[PDB]
Amino acid sequence: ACDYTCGSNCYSSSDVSTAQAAGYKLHEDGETVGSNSYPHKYNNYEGFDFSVSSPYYEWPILSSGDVYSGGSPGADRVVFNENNQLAGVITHTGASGNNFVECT
Numbered sequence: 383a384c385d386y387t388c389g390s391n392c393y394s395s396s397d398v399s400t401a402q403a404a405g406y407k408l409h410e411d412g413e414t415v416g417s418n419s420y421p422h423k424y425n426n427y428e429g430f431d432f433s434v435s436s437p438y439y440e441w442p443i444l445s446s447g448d449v450y451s452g453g454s455p456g457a458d459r460v461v462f463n464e465n466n467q468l469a470g471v472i473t474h475t476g477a478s479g480n481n482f483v484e485c486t
């Protein structure tokens with residue numbers, strides 16, 4: 383069973399932890415990857431009720447199992463905060479335009 387389901391993409395807690403770790407490291411070092419500069423601030427315009435405090439940062443999680451290193455980020459993201467706490471897993475899949483919905 384999937385711990386997080388984003389559309390047809392299936393993720394386990396291990397997938398999420400691995401992606402989060404890579405993203406948080408880049409954030410700590412003040413570096414970015416990709417044309418859209420990840421990780422970067424996630425403003426939460428959607429208004430999700432996260433259990434952890436802001437600021438939030440978004441980092442792509444890939445269905446391939448690889449850690450994001452550039453190119454297309456796909457539709458899925460892991461959102462973490464300043465204390466490397468997981469806020470949640472979100473996706474563009476099933477959402478209008480460039481909005482997000484939570485992965486179930």
Ligand SMILES: Nc1nc2c(ncn2[C@@H]2O[C@H](CO)[C@@H](OP(=O)(O)O)[C@H]2O)c(=O)[nH]1
Pocket residue numbers: 418419422423424425426427428440480481482
């Ligand atoms: N939908 C949405 N996009 C946000 C939010 N905060 C920042 N963004 C950015 O606005 C764009 C929405 O797809 C993305 O930028 P990017 O295209 O540079 O990756 C996304 O990172 C937010 O809370 N909601």
Ligand SMILES: [Ca+2]
Pocket residue numbers: 392393394397447
């Ligand atoms: Ca996996």
